[PDB]
């Protein structure tokens, strides 16, 4: 998948997928959550495994697996409920709202198995500031499957795996989206 170096892609494709991520970041950072949730595919799997500190010979166990506890591991129904909460005036974690920034780079694209689909690796810094002085800085990789669509966004998010560069979460909550 990203086992060997991705073949070169058309500059058109690189730019199209990059613009998709930059627009997605704008939706999240500007709290356009209705439009963000509309980017999610009906078959969305939104996954953020728990990461542990291991010695070398046991690094296969670094991430939680498929039937194991996780930070996020959601289908569309679960995510729809999260949208209902984060657009709510009695949602105390996000009212008042956090100020977030999603700085996206290192976009690498590989043709998926079905036409119109793409495997994408990219990296992020998420900077989250709230209330008076609270500041959490996150980084990680996002491994996505994007699927081309006729929405103004132009893709939908079929699959996301967030690989967070933290073991213990250095934040009191994870009340936003990666």
Identified binder of other proteins from the candidate list 7, 133, 150, 152, rule CB under 8 A: 133
Question: Among the candidate windows 20-28, 40-48, 73-81, 110-118, which touches a copy of itself by CB under 8 A?
Answer: 20-28
Cα 168 → chain centroid: 19
Is 135 a binding residue for other proteins by CB under 8 A? The answer is: no
Helix/strand/coil for 133:
coil
Residues in Cβ contact with 42 at an 8 Å cutoff, skipping those fewer than 6 apart: 76
How many residues of this chain bind a copy of itself (CB under 8 A)?
A: 63
Is 55 a binding residue for other proteins by CB under 8 A? The answer is: yes
Pairing mode, strands 40-49 and 134-148: unpaired
- CA dist., res. 143 & res. 3, Å (int): 13
Question: Among the candidate windows 32-40, 47-55, 106-114, 144-152, which touches other proteins by CB under 8 A?
Answer: 47-55
User: Which residue in the block uniquely carries the two structure tokens 């930059």?
Assistant: 22
Burial of 171 (0-12, 13-18, 19+ CB in 10 A): middle
Closest CA to 140 of 100, 105, 97, 99: 105
Binding residues for a copy of itself, rule: CB under 8 A, are 2, 4-6, 8, 11-12, 14-16, 19, 21-23, 25-26, 29, 31, 51, 53-57, 59, 89, 95-97, 99-108, 121, 123-125, 127-133, 135, 137, 139-141, 152-154, 165-168, 170
Binding residues for other proteins, rule: CB under 8 A, are 48, 50, 52-55, 58, 61, 64-65, 67-74, 78, 81-82, 84-86, 88, 90-93, 96, 131, 133-134, 167-175
């Amino acid at each position: 998948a990203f086992r060997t170096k991705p073949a070169p892609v058309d500059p058109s494709l690189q730019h199209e997928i990059e613009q998709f991520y930059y627009w997605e970041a704008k939706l999240l950072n500007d709290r356009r959550f209705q439009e963000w949730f509309d980017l999610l595919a009906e078959d969305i799997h939104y996954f953020m495994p728990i990461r542990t500190t291991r010695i070398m010979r046991e690094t296969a166990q670094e991430y939680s697996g498929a039937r194991e506890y996780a930070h996020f591991d959601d289908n569309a129904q679960m995510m729809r409920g999260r949208l209902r909460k984060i657009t709510s005036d009695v949602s105390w974690s996000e009212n008042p709202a956090s100020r977030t920034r999603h700085v996206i780079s290192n976009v690498m694209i590989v043709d998926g198995e079905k036409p119109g689909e793409y495997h994408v690796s990219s990296v992020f810094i998420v900077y989250r500031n709230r209330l008076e002085r609270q500041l959490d800085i996150f980084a990680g990789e996002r491994k996505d499957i994007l699927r081309r669509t006729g929405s103004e966004a132009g893709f939908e998010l079929a699959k996301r795996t967030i690989l967070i560069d933290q073991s213990t979460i250095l934040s009191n909550n994870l009340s936003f989206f990666f």
